[PDB]
């Protein structure tokens, strides 16, 4: 349906919220977290 | 391997002589329904003969 302007113009995908939350935040998810308890 | 050999032979008590031990180990692993099953087999086994004394 040509609306007179617009003709001119769950695999891995629900997780995308968690992943874009976790892009540069806890990128390993455990490999610091399992090793936090001996930092202090 | 015990149950394949005893329930055809003559000693009905030798079944439950190890099935009561199975009721021990299934109470020990907490298989409560199978412990109930072994106790029922023991009760229907002991309705024939007096047993090794205790």
């Amino acid at each position: 349906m040509s609306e007179k302007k617009q003709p001119v113009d769950e695999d891995n995908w629900d997780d995308d919220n968690v992943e874009d939350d976790f892009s540069n935040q806890l990128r390993a998810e455990l490999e610091k977290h399992g090793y936090k308890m001996e930092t202090s | 391997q015990l149950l394949r050999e005893l329930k055809k032979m003559d000693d009905k008590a030798l079944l439950v002589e190890v099935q009561l031990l199975e009721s021990k180990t299934y109470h020990a692993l907490s298989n409560l329904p199978k412990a109930r099953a072994a106790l029922t087999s023991a009760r229907t086994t002991a309705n024939a003969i007096y047993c090794p004394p205790k």
């Binding site: 769950e10 695999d11 891995n12 629900d14 997780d15 919220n17 968690v18 992943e19 939350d21 976790f22 935040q25 998810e29 455990l30 977290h33 399992g34 936090k36 308890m37 930092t39 202090s40 | 692993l29 907490s30 298989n31 409560l32 329904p33």
Partner: protein
Amino acid sequence: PKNPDLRIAQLRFLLSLPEHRGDAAVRDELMAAVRDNNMAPYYEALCKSLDWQIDVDLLNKMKKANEDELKRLDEELEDAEKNLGESEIRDAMMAKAEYLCRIGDKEGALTAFRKTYDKTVALGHRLDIVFYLLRIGLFYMDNDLITRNTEKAKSLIEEGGDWDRRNRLKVYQGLYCVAIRDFKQAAELFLDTVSTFTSYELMDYKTFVTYTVYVSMIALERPDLREKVIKGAEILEVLHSLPAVRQYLFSLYECRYSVFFQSLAVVEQEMKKDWLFAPHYRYYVREMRIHAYSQLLESYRSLTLGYMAEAFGVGVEFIDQELSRFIAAGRLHCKIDKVNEIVETNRPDSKNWQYQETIKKGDLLLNRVQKLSRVINM
């Protein structure tokens, strides 16, 4: 017929992500390639693995053995019609052609199944063919084959109270959902923990118990949780041989907070090298974290994170930014605070949102009724 082949799928996953060993793909993959007449498991791994030093000749002898099997099949197709019986062509080639499916992934499958499906005198004759699709649908994560054969099993294989290979259907759907994004289907359909006792997906029955606990720690409310994985004595043995699993369970019911990260680290490192868990291994972390934090917020309204710090071991700024991200997720409402530093919880969802949900339906719901009352007079 399928246990080392599902182990080949385990090896597909096992040399999918890591490269810490570049010679498992010769060790137990050539040990797989010499059994089961595994031809395609090296013919497709011939490119993604190494140069395969000279791996044609020791495989020439086995593709020649396959040629022997195939040529006695090609004689058998007219040797069985001379046998004056019913469908002995179909029998005598369906046997070795399901074996061709065991050899080759799709070719023996396609050349077999569209002939040996032609008469269906039993739903086993359908469902073994369905199984021989389900093996390759686990090997190659298909969708069309290994949901439409389940549609066919949900066409006529409802009949017959045989219950073994009808619970297999439940197990395969549980595996298929937990193979993608499952919350509840694997818990509901792995209810049948004890009552399976032998399969090929049961190549380790105790790992099936790991599967049902790794989904029933998510999809299961705490009364249901104690009723299933505590008041289940029949599952108590196979969780009882697994220490850290049972540790995480009885601690998670016990609210033993400082071992939660230990046990979660155990389960997460197990999550690394186990297949059908690549869409899951990062989601599961925050999932079980916020799942414990549910009753951790149910605990108090008067709460500091120093108490949380010596409840966890290190969480001060870690859990500050972490619970900040959980609030940013929308769930877990509490006011974490600067120096006053009182983590204050709320009251449940009665107040006005219980009032509000009805018209939150009747915004778009009633837009539906508005515009579809505007359907009548153009």
